Design a protein around this ligand. Structure first.
Ligand SMILES: [Cl-]
Ligand SMILES: [Cl-]
Ligand SMILES: [Cl-]
Ligand SMILES: [Cl-]
Ligand SMILES: [Cl-]
Lengths: 186, 183
């Protein structure tokens, strides 16, 4: 009874396309197991700091979304020349802040929450510049929600404070970060 | 909580959304899907092999989609982008000729249209030559050798045949896409 339909053929092909995507994605994640681990730790710290399991989940969800968005733009060459210049700037800034985080951990007396806050703000601004010509509905707000939370001096003080209960987390975080610096992911 | 799980999800989702929007813009469109449906009808009426018509349209749709995805994902190199522009111009020219040959009966030259179609084929081959799967090449050939075939075109344009209403619809659709600057 059903007659020929090109729409049907197209949707049939799309089925296979979507399966292949599922595969490729599983085999080539934009986010490393190491990068994810760091994310789980920032998650736990976020929990302890906000005592709001769901605000934590929201924050991390958003962060992962923005990250994935940037990764997809960069993998699909959506970035212009100017924008690639901004990608490099962001690479540098991110390297600086990661080493600053690790150093504030490994070397006591050096931790300044204002310095690290300032750096994270610089990261945020770079991300904004990066997605200006590519901004979906929810993004801008996700960017601010994530980076304002991580550059809040009190979150940082919580993460680093010795008289706290995150020390172990900050450690695994810095271990991860050092792995990524080594592999030159960061 | 597993960031790895949320990241898996999110990446799959964005990639999938992109893929399906590409498919929708290309083929799901009403005017476009109707044109392809008519092309099916005319190739069935020309071959009297339902199955073979289906195969032709299926290769057409597979190649069309493959190219749509290479395009949206910026998978084409600079030279390749030169070739895409050339292909859009050649495809535009052949659309306009399809329409003119119909609108003005006496000006129908099956060899002109055929040669335009082979030009399109050459440009498609040139365009995907570095992005082949083990079957793309032959699909391109099957489709274009079928539509460029002078006998096919004669069946399509024959004023005494039964493909005239199809042709008229095909040309209506084509005119729509021309006006929308799709084609
Ligand atoms: Cl969104
Ligand atoms: Cl290139
Ligand atoms: Cl005559
Ligand atoms: Cl004739
Ligand atoms: Cl005739």
């Amino acid at each position: 009874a059903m007659v020929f339909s090109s729409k049907s053929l197209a949707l049939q092909a799309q089925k296979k396309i979507l399966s292949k995507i599922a595969s490729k994605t599983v085999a080539n994640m934009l986010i490393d197991d190491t990068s994810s681990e760091i994310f789980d730790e920032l998650y736990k710290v976020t929990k302890e700091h906000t005592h709001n399991k769901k605000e934590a989940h929201k924050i991390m969800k958003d962060l992962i979304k923005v990250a994935i968005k940037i990764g997809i733009l960069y993998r699909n060459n959506q970035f212009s020349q100017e924008e690639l210049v901004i990608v490099e700037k962001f690479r540098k800034k991110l390297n600086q802040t990661a080493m600053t985080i690790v150093s504030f951990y490994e070397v006591e007396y050096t931790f300044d929450r204002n310095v690290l806050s300032n750096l994270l703000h610089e990261c945020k601004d770079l991300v904004h510049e990066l997605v200006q010509r590519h901004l979906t509905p929810r993004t801008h707000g996700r960017i601010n929600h994530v980076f304002n939370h991580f550059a809040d001096v009190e979150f940082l003080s919580t993460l680093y404070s010795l008289d706290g209960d995150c020390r172990p987390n900050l450690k695994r975080i810095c271990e991860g970060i050092n792995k990524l610096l080594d592999e030159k992911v960061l």
